[PDB]
Swiss-Prot record:
Keywords: Coiled coil, Cytoplasm, DNA damage, DNA recombination, DNA repair, Isopeptide bond, Nucleus, Transcription, Transcription regulation, Ubl conjugation. Belongs to the actin family. ARP5 subfamily. Its main location: nucleus. PANTHER family: ACTIN. This is Actin-related protein 5. Proposed core component of the chromatin remodeling INO80 complex which is involved in transcriptional regulation, DNA replication and probably DNA repair. Involved in DNA double-strand break repair and UV-damage excision repair. Component of the chromatin remodeling INO80 complex; specifically part of a complex module associated with the helicase ATP-binding and the helicase C-terminal domain of INO80. Interacts with DDB1. Interacts with ACTR8; the interaction is observed in asynchronous (interphase) cells but not in metaphase-arrested cells indicative for a possible dissociation of the INO80 complex in mitotic cells. GO terms for cellular component: cytoplasm; Ino80 complex; nucleoplasm; nucleus. It holds the Pfam family Actin.
Length: 412
DNA sequence: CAATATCCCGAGTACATGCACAGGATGTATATATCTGACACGTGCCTGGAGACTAGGGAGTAATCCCCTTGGCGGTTAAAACGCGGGGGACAGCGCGTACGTGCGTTTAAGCGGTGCTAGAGCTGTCTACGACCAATTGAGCGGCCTCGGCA
């Protein structure tokens, strides 16, 4: 039976939890598309004690017009396909986050910040995100990095130079990232235009067509439960669906999702039987052709990037296949990935598949551990004055960050 | 002549209508405007006129029986009228849509310069289609040979 989600927690703090040693403790801000995750670096403690503000990245303002609201509670959100592209709907998302974390007082946030961004970020987008940050909030110095690569940095066996493929899958994108000597080989990195949002959207539209008698009973927040709790990824889809074909297996494995009641009441207050549907929603990232979409999918793409290298460095970078982010949470994901990988390697060769320690939070914990180390490496950060000579389309090439290129944007 | 029916006249009957009222949105009122197109001017075409001639058609007639037209036909139901059934008719309320208002932002119109699409050109330059004629076919009717039924 379905549950309902929680809302409106009580995060309130003093003006700044400044510890011993250096006073400018940075904010660690994972600016996610599904949800934002934000908090103080809190140095000198091994386990990250409190990743506060776990909240959905969505805002309310309706037919009333005169007000808007920002916490977990018609709706809007600041992103287009995992790049932020909104003005004040970004501000009132930052404002919520700062106010609930506490801030000093004066006409700026006194603390430096580390902020996640898109695997590639359009130059205009980076420029705007820098302007909307330095101008309005007055931050002293800033760092941009990629969610996935922070999660890798967290999960590495050692704080040392590495190579691998990162497999990442968030709200509206999945990416395959080849990395060599700690550097993202962004020349031949690739992404797929699908993700967990689109899975839920498909599972919704399926069950709407299965039970037209009660369109209103099924809605995204209930699709979330069946997709998180009750769905799994096949080892081989055309074989799973084949064992699902016989009634004696079906009845033993179909999921009985009881709606809340007011004929045994199921003619409207149905038990929403999900069978094959609990496979067809996860599978979208491996076979986007279950939707209309003609793209290679996470299987053909991995082969298509992996055959663009010399045969020795393939055998190097496949030694660390890493799973992180959103959709990798499905049960069975490691097994499907390592089976699909076994067919596309030399007959006796070796590979290894690692799953992130906490697939959803390790991006933030990574950004924490990174900033807490690189406090004083002033070649890594963008300082407030640099933004006055370099127009905002500028970045500092540390590991776990997008590849910079010399370029400039006309503005007046 | 009797009977069912339509017509006609006066009592008694809700509300419909015509009115008065407040007030609001728009019709007026003035000044300005360019430009539609009025008007004026020739250009050049066809609408018309005007002849000579054949041949196609039209008009006429003649004969006539097909078709219409009529009477009288025989056969069966729409109408008449009644009994008889249920169904169209008159109140209580829910809330869903429609409207309407707000702020939603998509697109068009305009004016910009460049340029290639189309629509008037040809004797284009032929040659599909247009007569012109020939040939095949079927069908129908008229002679001609031959078994049999009713009559000497
Ligand atoms: N436990 C889970 N099982 C399955 N899917 C999950 C789970 N938790 C989150 N998701 C999916 O993860 C996606 C969001 O992941 P996230 O890393 O926050 O995205 P991003 O970094 O792009 O904002 C959502 O589409 C959601 O459906």
């Amino acid at each position: 039976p379905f549950r309902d989600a929680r809302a409106a927690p009580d995060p309130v703090l003093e003006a700044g939890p400044v510890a011993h040693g250096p006073l400018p403790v940075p904010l660690v801000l994972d600016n996610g598309s599904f949800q934002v995750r934000a908090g103080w670096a809190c140095p000198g403690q091994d386990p990250g004690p409190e990743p506060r503000l776990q909240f959905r990245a969505v805002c309310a303002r309706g037919r009333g017009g005169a007000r808007g609201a920002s916490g977990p509670q018609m709706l809007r959100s600041p992103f287009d396909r995992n790049v932020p592209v909104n003005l004040e709907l970004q501000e009132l998302l930052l404002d919520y986050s700062f106010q609930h974390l506490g801030v000093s007082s004066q006409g700026c946030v006194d603390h430096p910040i580390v902020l996640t961004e898109a695997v590639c970020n359009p130059l205009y987008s980076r420029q705007m995100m820098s302007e909307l940050l330095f101008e309005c909030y007055g931050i002293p110095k800033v760092a941009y990095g990629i969610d996935s690569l922070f999660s890798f940095y967290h999960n590495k066996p050692k704080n040392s130079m590495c190579s691998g493929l990162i497999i990442s899958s968030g709200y509206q994108c999945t990416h395959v990232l080849p990395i060599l000597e700690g550097r993202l080989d962004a020349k031949n990195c690739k992404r797929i235009n699908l993700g967990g949002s689109q899975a839920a959207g498909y599972l919704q539209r399926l069950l709407q067509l299965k039970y037209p008698g009660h369109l209103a009973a099924i809605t995204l927040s209930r699709m979330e439960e069946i997709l998180h709790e009750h769905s799994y990824i096949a080892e081989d889809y055309v074989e799973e669906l084949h064992k699902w074909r016989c009634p004696d297996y079906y009845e033993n494995n179909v999921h009985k999702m009881q709606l809340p009641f007011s004929v045994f009441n199921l003619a409207a207050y149905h038990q929403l039987f999900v069978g094959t549907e609990r496979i067809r929603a996860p599978e979208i990232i491996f076979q986007p052709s279950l939707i209309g979409e003609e793209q290679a999918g996470i299987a053909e793409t991995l082969q298509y990037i992996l055959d663009r290298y010399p045969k020795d460095i393939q055998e190097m970078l496949v030694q660390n296949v890493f799973l992180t982010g959103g959709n990798t949470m499905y049960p069975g994901m490691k097994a499907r990935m390592e089976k699909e990988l076994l067919e596309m390697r030399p007959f006796r060769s070796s590979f290894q598949v690692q799953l992130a320690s906490n697939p959803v939070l390790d991006a933030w914990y990574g950004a924490r551990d990174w900033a807490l180390n690189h406090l004083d490496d002033n070649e890594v950060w963008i300082t407030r004055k640099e933004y006055e000579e370099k127009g905002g389309e500028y970045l500092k090439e540390h590991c776990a960050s997008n590849i910079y290129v010399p370029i400039r944007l006309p503005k007046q």
